Amino acid sequence: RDEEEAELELLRQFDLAWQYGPCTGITRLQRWCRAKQMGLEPPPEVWQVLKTHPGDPRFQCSLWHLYPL
């Protein structure tokens, strides 16, 4: 549970980072790829975590996914 909790916290911090742009309506992998395309050099740990937990909506979905914005 500790590893999963730490990984969830890391992904949430990545979602709440302000220097990559908004984080509503796009999956985290798309946001990370867009950040890399512009040369901002997003962290590789987030990409590895996303790639090691495929299909689970707790990871791919953005932070404000559940709420009806």
């Binding site: 911090q13 709440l16 980072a17 302000w18 932070l63 709420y67 009806p68 914005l69």
Partner: protein
């Protein structure tokens, strides 16, 4: 029966407040230079006086002090008065006044002589000592003095002149209540037997008694003369900069008339908090911490706040235009805020709903975290703030159960209480109030989103701080816009009560104070006692101008006219015995006899005459002043004068009160009926075609202070001329100040029923209108959907401005047809209800309770807690299901596309108002058939299927072979619809960004009362569905080359 229980509850509250109010055992105990109050100069109390404006006055019990040239340096339990206020330069001033004790009066029993007086005193001194009742708390003597004076009762007309009375002065305030009661039981006095004494003015507060005796009105200027006081240099019991001790016979009061009408530079602090509670649970003080506290301080008079501050937990990003501090641990945050409140030392504290949710939560959290020094907020050192519970209930403003926080030395003005007690609105939430008063709809944020932002990075916390600062600043904008403080100061200056009493006690205290002030001149006591023919209208649509005649304060003018007052009343069967002549008194229709001014002038006529003179002077001086501040002050003054003059009768006529009398109310109502009848007959008599006039005028509407007449002319100028001439002619026969004046003219007049009329307003220009006036709000209840109000407003505008009843009928038909075809948006049909009472508090099950329970069973996170407002709409369900079971959350309906019960809306929201409006126009009964009984009132009307033939398709094309040649025609029918959605989409989301106040940042507004919130989601879903539908046709072309 609410009035009697309210009086009992207020009496119990006063009795509780009196007990243990003696703060003698209650005492148990990195700075910016901008905060400090200006430094006091070198002051010598032997040459210069002290001048300051006092805000609040209260009393505490303690040992006596050596005031120079005054009381001896004793330690007896004598009352001490305190006055907190502001000097000219801004120094807070706290003043101590000594040597004042409460007193009351009793009538002289037969055969009483001076020699018994002292003996009586002894017996009374024996009473409280012998009587264990009173808490068994006594030190020395119980009665300080017994004196004999000459007074006459104000109730009735005896005509025997002044009579002896006994004035009894006791040491302590709280001892007034017990001894008075004993005086009703009779006291054994040797020689005199066991006589009884009727109480007189035994239920008057000590502060009010001092204000009446020394002639000091609330929020007025005081001067302590040089050499008459003493200045404390050590052991200041309070936190103020100047403490002065002065006897009560030297404090000079300056009435606020002329150069002494200015307002000192008060300090107003608006404060707010933000907390991070658990998911789906209303915040609680035990476990949920407080993260942000925002404050704005403003010197009164300046147009901008002079201090912004935002204290947040954890490090925060800097803000331009304010100051941000970061505290690691919450205890330091709370203690720092307490130190800030002590050092800044504001004199008015405000916010929004701070009396019920902010201060109790902060104090409970401080107690839980074991921060001992937070509660010390009052100006008195060592006074722990105490939370109490109380309630205020009325059949019009509802029931409120609120906590009250005691802060001695500061005045709290919670805007929610002021709005509740001075306005009537559909919704009292902050967002709705802001939208209604300033036109700006503010952003709403869920608590889970705030909790998520708390764990974010520095910029997110900065955004939260900015939101909290804006929310705390809005009440200051409301206070400046409505000028609440100026009106409050004007009321406190006119009615002679301190500023705080305007928000804790009823209407009777003001009239009691004014009556005592007026009666003290003539030496008249106040004994304590225990508790129409409206003109028939003609509903319809008058397409000719209608003239309006108004009575200027009919009831007070009638009271002034015929000498109606407490002292002018005659006991039945007394005039013959007293030898009065038949031309001295008048006989009211209800059978009461009142003497004219030739014998005695009553208190009420003099008070009302003084009020009218003051209003006339204020109106005269308004036209010449150019300074906006003095214009606001004079406007407040005239408004307060008018309100007090109106409320005099409201006091007098109350069945339950401190001095009820139904004879005056009956006489006033009879005179009103008689005068209205006389006006109607005279108006009918004058304007006749016999006297050469074109048309016969007649009165069509009449009630109290409103007569609406028809003169048969079609030109507005002639209507106004005839109205003014009629006003003068009628006022030339009504004796005494009672007058009737022209008010306005409505050309298109729609008279629904009594107290229900509408028209177009013509006030100044006979050719150009001003607005659309309409009484009888009708669509005012919060449970009525906005659709009803919109339809009523549209119908009224079409009937009045467009003057096309057919157009209004067509619009109503179109609206009904759209409603019956599921075309009207859901946002218009939302009904919101508050969980005011607990689920077990309802006699029967209701819709919102079941909806809240089901939402909680679905997901606790989004489930509203008790006390919040839940929205719902009536969904279509099977017959036999309970009525409360048809409610559902609008978002759930939007997600599942559930059917809406249209019949309930049709026959329970639009039938009654439309029928009431259109009965005078199209006639009773026929209008029902025209509106909701007819063809328009009915308007009768997974695999891929062809849109044309509606058949199952073997393939996945748009149409089958049978509908092939028409395929093109279908395409133009589809894309043209999609376009009509896309534009709307582009006009919705961008709008929210303007509402948010930023472009690049995300949108987190989830307000449930903004129709855009529902509309944007519906538009998004419709766009997705339409794109999926249009993909069935062939693709427009390649996209990979």
């Amino acid at each position: 029966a609410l009035m009697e229980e309210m009086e009992a509850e207020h009496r119990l509250q006063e009795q509780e407040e009196e007990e243990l109010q003696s703060v003698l055992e209650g005492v148990a105990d990195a700075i910016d230079p901008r905060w400090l109050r200006p430094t006091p100069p070198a002051l010598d109390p032997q040459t210069e006086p002290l001048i300051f404006q006092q805000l609040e006055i209260d009393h505490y019990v303690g040992p006596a002090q050596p005031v120079p040239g005054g009381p001896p340096p004793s330690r007896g339990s004598v009352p001490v008065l305190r006055a907190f206020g502001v000097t000219d330069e801004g120094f807070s001033v706290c003043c101590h006044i000594h040597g004042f004790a409460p007193y009351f009066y009793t009538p002289a029993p037969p055969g009483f002589g001076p020699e018994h007086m002292g003996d009586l005193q002894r017996e009374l001194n024996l009473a409280i000592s012998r009587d264990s009742r009173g808490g068994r708390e006594l030190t020395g003597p119980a009665v300080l003095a017994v004196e004999l004076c000459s007074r006459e009762s104000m109730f009735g007309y005896h005509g025997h002149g002044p009579s002896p009375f006994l004035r009894i002065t006791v040491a302590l305030p709280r001892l007034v209540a017990p001894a008075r009661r004993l005086l009703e039981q009779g006291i054994r006095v040797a020689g005199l037997g066991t006589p009884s004494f009727a109480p007189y003015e035994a239920n008057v507060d000590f502060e009010i008694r001092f204000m009446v005796d020394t002639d000091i009105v609330g929020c007025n200027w005081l001067e302590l003369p040089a050499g008459k006081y003493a200045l404390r240099l050590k052991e200041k019991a309070t936190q103020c900069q100047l403490e002065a001790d002065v006897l009560w016979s030297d404090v000079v009061s300056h009435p606020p008339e002329g150069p002494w009408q200015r307002i000192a530079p008060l300090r107003v602090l608006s404060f707010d908090i933000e907390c991070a509670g658990r998911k789906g649970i209303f915040p609680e003080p035990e476990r949920d911490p407080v993260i942000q506290i925002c404050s704005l301080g403003l010197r009164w008079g300046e147009p901008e706040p002079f201090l912004r501050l935002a204290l947040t937990l954890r490090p925060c990003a800097p803000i331009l235009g304010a100051k941000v501090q970061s505290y690691e641990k919450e205890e330091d945050l709370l203690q720092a805020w307490s130190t800030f409140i002590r050092i800044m030392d504001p004199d008015v504290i405000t916010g929004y709903n701070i009396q019920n949710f902010d201060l109790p939560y902060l104090i409970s959290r401080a107690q839980t975290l074991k921060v001992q020094t937070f509660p010390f907020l009052g100006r008195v050192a060592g006074l722990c703030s105490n939370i109490r519970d109380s309630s205020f209930q009325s059949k019009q403003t509802g029931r409120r159960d609120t906590k009250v926080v005691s802060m001695v030395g500061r005045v709290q003005m919670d805007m929610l209480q002021v709005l509740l007690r001075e306005y009537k609105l559909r919704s009292y939430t902050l967002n709705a109030v802001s939208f209604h008063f300033l036109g700006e709809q503010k952003e709403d944020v869920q608590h889970s989103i705030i909790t998520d932002l708390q764990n974010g990075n520095d910029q997110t916390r900065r955004r939260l701080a900015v939101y909290c600062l804006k929310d705390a600043y809005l009440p200051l904008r409301l206070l400046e816009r409505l000028m609440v403080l100026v009106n409050a100061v004007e009321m406190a200056r006119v009615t002679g009560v301190p500023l705080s009493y305007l928000l804790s006690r009823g209407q009777q205290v003001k009239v009691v104070s004014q009556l005592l002030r007026q009666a003290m001149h003539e030496g008249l006591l106040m004994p304590v006692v225990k508790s129409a023919t409206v003109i028939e209208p003609l509903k319809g649509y008058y397409d000719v101008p209608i003239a309006t005649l108004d009575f200027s304060s009919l009831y007070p003018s009638i009271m002034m006219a015929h000498n109606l007052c407490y002292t002018t009343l005659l006991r039945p069967g007394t005039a013959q015995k007293l030898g009065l002549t038949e031309d001295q008194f008048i006989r009211t229709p209800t059978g009461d006899e009142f003497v004219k001014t030739s014998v005695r002038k009553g208190l009420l006529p003099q008070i009302l005459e003084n009020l009218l003179s003051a209003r006339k002077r204020a109106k005269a001086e308004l036209a010449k002043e150019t300074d906006p501040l003095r214009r606001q002050v004079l406007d407040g003054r005239q408004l307060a004068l008018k309100v007090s003059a109106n409320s005099v009768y409201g006091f007098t006529g109350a069945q339950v009160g401190k001095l009820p009398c139904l004879e005056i109310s009956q006489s006033v109502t009879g005179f009103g009926r008689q005068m209205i009848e006389k006006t109607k007959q005279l108006v009918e008599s004058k304007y006749t075609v016999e006297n050469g006039y074109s048309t016969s005028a007649k009165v069509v509407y009449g009630d109290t202070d409103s007569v609406m007449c028809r003169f048969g002319v079609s030109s507005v100028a002639e209507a106004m001329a005839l109205g003014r001439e009629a006003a003068d002619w009628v006022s030339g026969h009504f004796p005494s100040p009672i007058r009737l004046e022209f008010e306005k003219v409505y050309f298109p007049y729609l008279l629904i029923s009594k107290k229900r009329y509408a028209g177009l307003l013509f006030s100044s220009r006979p050719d150009a209108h001003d607005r659309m006036d309409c009484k009888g709000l009708e669509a005012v209840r919060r449970d009525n959907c906005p659709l009803v109000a919109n339809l009523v407003t549209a119908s009224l505008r079409r009937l009045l401005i467009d003057r096309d009843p057919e157009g209004a009928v067509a619009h109503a038909q179109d609206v009904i047809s759209d409603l019956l075809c599921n075309r009207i948006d859901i946002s218009q049909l939302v009904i919101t209800k508050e969980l005011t009472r607990a689920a077990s508090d309802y006699a029967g099950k209701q819709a919102h309770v079941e909806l809240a329970e089901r939402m909680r069973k679905r997901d606790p996170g989004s489930a509203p807690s008790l006390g919040d407002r839940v929205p719902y709409v009536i969904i279509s369900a099977a017959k036999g299901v309970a009525a409360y079971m048809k409610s559902e959350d609008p978002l759930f309906v939007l997600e599942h596309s559930l059917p809406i019960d249209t019949q309930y809306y049709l026959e329970q929201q639009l039938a009654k108002p439309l029928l009431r409006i259109f009965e005078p126009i199209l006639g009773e009964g026929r209008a029902e058939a025209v509106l909701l009984r007819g063809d328009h009132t009915r308007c009768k009307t997974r695999r891929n299927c062809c849109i044309g033939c509606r058949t199952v398709l073997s393939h996945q094309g748009a149409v089958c072979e049978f509908c092939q040649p028409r395929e093109s025609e279908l395409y133009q029918k589809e894309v043209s619809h999609l376009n009509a959605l896309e534009e709307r989409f582009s006009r919705l989301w961008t709008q929210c960004q303007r509402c948010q106040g930023s472009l690049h940042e995300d949108v987190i507004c989830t307000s449930r009362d903004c129709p855009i919130f529902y509309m944007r989601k519906k538009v998004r879903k419709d766009l997705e569905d339409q794109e999926q539908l249009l993909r069935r046709f062939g693709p427009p072309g390649p996209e990979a080359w």
